[PDB]
Design a protein around this ligand. Sequence first.
Ligand code: 9N6
Ligand code: NA
Length: 484
Amino acid sequence: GLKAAQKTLFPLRSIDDVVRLFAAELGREEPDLVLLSLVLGFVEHFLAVNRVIPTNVPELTFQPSPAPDPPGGLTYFPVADLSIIAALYARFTAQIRGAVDLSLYPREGGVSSRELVKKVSDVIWNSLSRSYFKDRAHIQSLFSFITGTKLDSSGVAFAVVGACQALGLRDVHLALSEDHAWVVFGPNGEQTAEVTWHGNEDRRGQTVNAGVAERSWLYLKGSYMRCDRKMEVAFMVCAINPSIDLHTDSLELLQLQQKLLWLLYDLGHLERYPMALGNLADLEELEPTPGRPDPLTLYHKGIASAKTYYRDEHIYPYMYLAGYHCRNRNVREALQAWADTATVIQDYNYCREDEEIYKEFFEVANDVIPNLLKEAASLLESALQDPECFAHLLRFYDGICKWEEGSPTPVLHVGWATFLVQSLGRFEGQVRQKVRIVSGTVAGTARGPGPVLTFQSEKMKGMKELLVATKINSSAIKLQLTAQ
Ligand SMILES: CCN(C(=O)c1cc(F)ccc1Oc1nncnc1N1CCC2(C1)CN([C@H](CCCN(C)CCOC)C(C)C)C2)C(C)C
Ligand code: NA
């Protein structure tokens, strides 16, 4: 049951028609997330999941339009009928409102009870069909939910907040960290309740307090994102996955996203959203929008956003930057940024379901850095002659030992140790000996009338003068890395 203001915006014959729809909804008081998420789901289906166009199907129709050179020729965008999307929309509303009874739960001064929210979660929980033995992609949107009843972990949380909007509940909102989503609610908006899975132990109906308390990356020591309705649109925008298969991405779904991120950027709703500022910078690198800022400019906004709004406890802000440096073959600035990545992670404790960030750290230490160094060593006969890199490298390994400290699980093992020695070896003994490790002479500075380094970790302190030697001790370091 949409408004006539919404209905006249259709049909969506192009990306610009979608971008237009999204702009109009942002200007309204409560943006219709259900509508918007369906539109993203619809278009993505044809643009990525099932590109083949049917024969004897009057319901659907496509719009020809020139494609850019070198490719040239035309491209056929799926025209969103109002008749199609109106039906889908009304099924969801009828499903949710048919499933629940709002007049039972007396929201005394608009107070949605924890009782009430657990029901809405359970309505989404009982109707879904989970892809267990396969990792299905493109199962994020309410299109996927209404059509196939398949949703990824994060999409379940989003689906609840959709239903909460479908029942007029303004106070229920999507919470998320860098790799997990739940719901945030209350009068002052400080309740937490799990509404999904992660990878595992099924725990819905609980607060996220124990997660915060144990200093795990998945919950960010409390410094996670609380979304207003406008930020929830930026999430569904970010959830667009253009990949047809492993190595190919759809150009239309790129442009669609890249355009839609800029719109939000202008309206100001990427201000408290670091990961979105990185994704737009990643897109700018691939295809730079004409008359717009640079990736670096956009990456540094995401860093400051995390520093100001999120207590400088986010990790990906720095990794976004180092990757750009890495793909540009600027070896000094990349390690520097990976050392800054270590600065944040040192003050965590590695718990079991912080799986995703380990994988990223592992790849830097054991694939990307040695790749860059193998390039650098071949390029030499320089960043290897430049002693500033080795100070950054040691501080990157420093934070991972410190990360590991205070955990129930070990981080480092023999597999890691090989590449440390390989990377250590890439710098000459003349270069590495110049670095000075000190405790500190005097604290502070005052207004009156070689390069320094400092380890926080026990392990790097344990091998202080082993790292600085003339000839490398490959056997001894491997052992001293691992400990109880
Ligand atoms: C990406 C899907 N997604 C989640 O995985 C997710 C789901 C949740 F529940 C919570 C958070 C979540 O993470 C993100 N939340 N908001 C925005 N983006 C998220 N992504 C997570 C992975 C991501 C962004 C990309 N990662 C970076 C790599 C970028 C590499 N690029 C593409 C290369 C460019 O080369 C030209 C970092 C490793 C640096 C961070 C959300 C959007 C539904
Ligand atoms: Na630690």
